[PDB]
Amino acid sequence: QEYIGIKLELINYTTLLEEQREAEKLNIKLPRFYSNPKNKAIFDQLWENQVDNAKVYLLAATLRPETMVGQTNCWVLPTGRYGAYYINKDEVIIVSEHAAVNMAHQGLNNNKPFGELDFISEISGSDLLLATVRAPLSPYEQIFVLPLETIKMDKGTGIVTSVPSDAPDDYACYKDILENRNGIAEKYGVDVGLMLEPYSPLPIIEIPDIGTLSAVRLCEESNVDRAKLTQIKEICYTKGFYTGIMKMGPFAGQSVKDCKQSCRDLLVQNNQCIVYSEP
């Protein structure tokens, strides 16, 4: 099985500010130009490792490219150790070492010999947490990197996509953060009103006999934990594939089975993903 690695672009607020130059002056208050300090610190560190000016992407493995228009956020292990690498010129990805190794055994380095890495610097989960990325296919102009304590640095890239409308586990954690369950939002310094409230789950797929926010509907009507979660994930992933109909995105009106391969190809044409494989 091939993994689709979604290129989540770490937003460069410096570039944007040196491009936003090519109301309020009437006593009507609105947000000052937003800037994310976690993004800046990652860049400052990359600078002090001679990266010049390059595009930087968190890479998040997914087996479900059709759900990509429903991203509300993404997940990193708060204690995870990630690394910054070159894949080619002018382009840097942040992944687990496990992923970078498995990516070197299929020649995806910056012209380096087989199996060797193009290491730049180490990035901790702490540094990544509460950063903002540009998520491909999502209507959201940016999303936040959020904490998932159950991420395994030995599977995928250590970064996971979040589609709460159609992944029960995604929704459970998302909802846990939103309502500060057991103080979990405070523990990681999450500004809930800025980082979650504007990014509600999206009606991307309609499953006949259930509806559009299936993971949400089933989760809320079963009042949600792990055994019920595996059960709903079974319905969502199975019924989703066989009966699911896209309601959002460029393939709206098409079924999930038919446009699954199609969303893959669009991601590659957009250069918004990296396709790889693992044992």
Based on the structure, what is the number of domains in the chain? Answer: 1
Resolution (A): 2.6
Q: What was the elucidation method?
A: X-ray
Place of tokens 């990193």: 76
Domain of 236, in residue numbers: 1-279
CATH assignment at residue 175: 3.90.740.10
* Spatial separation of the C-alpha atoms in residues 198 and 174, rounded to whole Å: 12
C-beta atoms surrounding 223 within 10 Å = 6
* Spatial separation of the C-alpha atoms in residues 51 and 93, rounded to whole Å: 12
* Spatial separation of the C-alpha atoms in residues 231 and 236, rounded to whole Å: 9
Place of tokens 């070492």: 97
